[PDB]
Amino acid sequence: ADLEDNMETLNDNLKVIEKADNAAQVKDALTKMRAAALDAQKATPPKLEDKSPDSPEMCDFAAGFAILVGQIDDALKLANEGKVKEAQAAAEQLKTTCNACHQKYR
Numbered sequence: 001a002d003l004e005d006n007m008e009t010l011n012d013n014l015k016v017i018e019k020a021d022n023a024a025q026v027k028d029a030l031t032k033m034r035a036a037a038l039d040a041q042k043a044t045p046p047k048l049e050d051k052s053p054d055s056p057e058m059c060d061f062a063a064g065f066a067i068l069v070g071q072i073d074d075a076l077k078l079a080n081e082g083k084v085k086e087a088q089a090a091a092e093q094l095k096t097t098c099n100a101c102h103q104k105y106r
């Protein structure tokens with residue numbers, strides 16, 4: 001899966017989470033998100049393809065997934081404890097991570 005594919009997975013699954021009723025779908029979606037985030041972490045985006053791997057832009061980019069992955073884990077712990085509404089608020093919060101990265105690198 002390339003970067004676009006992983007982004008679609010992140011987006012589709014975030015929509016499942018916000019619309020859901022139940023812990024099962026929230027857990028499942030978060031789990032798919034986690035996978036997609038770890039996969040995207042290895043990618044170099046179009047805007048950065050001419051930078052060096054240890055340019056601040058590139059380290060910034062990786063840092064944003066590392067945050068996202070941590071946030072997904074936090075929501076997933078919540079969902080595992082049956083705090084569906086709380087897990088769901090956690091998912092909404094981490095849109096900031098999506099949006100702040102897109103603002104620079106999309």
Ligand code: HEM
Nearest residue numbers: 003004007008010011045061064065068097098101105106
């Ligand atoms: C859960 C959070 C996120 C969601 C919902 C999300 C959603 C999406 C979507 C719908 C697109 C368009 C994909 C396409 O062209 O078909 C996209 C593109 C992109 N996203 Fe995200 N994203 C998220 C997190 C991130 C993060 C954290 C970053 C950077 C750390 C990021 C970097 C990018 C890049 C660089 C593009 C453009 C990729 C390209 O055109 O090849 N995204 N994202």
Ligand SMILES: CC(=O)Nc1cc2cccnc2c2ncccc12
Nearest residue numbers: 041042043044053054058059061062
């Ligand atoms: C500071 C940082 O996270 N650098 C990196 C950031 C990266 C971001 C996306 C793709 N690869 C890298 C990378 N690859 C090899 C060595 C370092 C990096």
